[PDB]
């Protein structure tokens, strides 16, 4: 997230592109983060984020 913000502030991508990147780094991020194996309980939060992404 911090590096995406830096790239948004380094002129690599547009601000709308930064918002899309944040949306990707939050929703559908269980695959990217891979925190489910570390703590199985987080899968509920991952499913909630997926549902929020679907609604949005």
């Amino acid at each position: 997230v911090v590096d995406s913000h830096v790239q948004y502030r380094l002129g690599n991508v547009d601000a709308f592109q930064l918002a899309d990147g944040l949306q990707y780094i939050f929703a559908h991020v269980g695959q990217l983060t891979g925190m489910y194996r570390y703590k199985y309980k987080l899968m509920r939060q991952i499913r909630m984020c997926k549902d929020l992404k679907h609604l949005i």
Binding site: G30, Q31, Y36, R37, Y40, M43, I46, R47, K50, D51
Partner: protein, 101 residues
């Protein structure tokens, strides 16, 4: 449906990290038509749901309130409404005028 309704009446009388919630766990499969196809919340022809596209939401209106508005409004009221609609269309065109490639 009908057989499903009768079966429901009789019934009332008597590891793996799944990422996406499967559609099996969904609800709102109602046999009755009245509780399946219910009239939407048409806010007196002047409102709609949030988030959805305003142009799309207004386009897909039921037109029931619009008919009453066009068959009840006064002639001067009709002229004022036409002027307001013309102003809104001009604003949309100005928005459409700023779009180019």
């Amino acid at each position: 449906d009908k057989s499903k309704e009768l079966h429901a009446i009789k019934e009332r009388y008597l590891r793996k990290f799944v990422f996406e919630w499967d559609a099996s766990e969904d609800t709102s499969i109602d046999y009755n038509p009245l509780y399946k196809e219910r009239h939407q919340v048409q806010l007196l022809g002047r409102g709609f749901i949030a988030g959805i596209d305003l142009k799309q939401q207004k386009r897909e209106q039921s037109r029931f309130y619009g008919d009453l508005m066009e068959k009840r409004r006064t002639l001067e009221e009709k002229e004022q409404e036409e002027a307001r609609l013309r102003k809104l269309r001009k604003k949309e065109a100005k928005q459409r005028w700023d779009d180019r490639h």
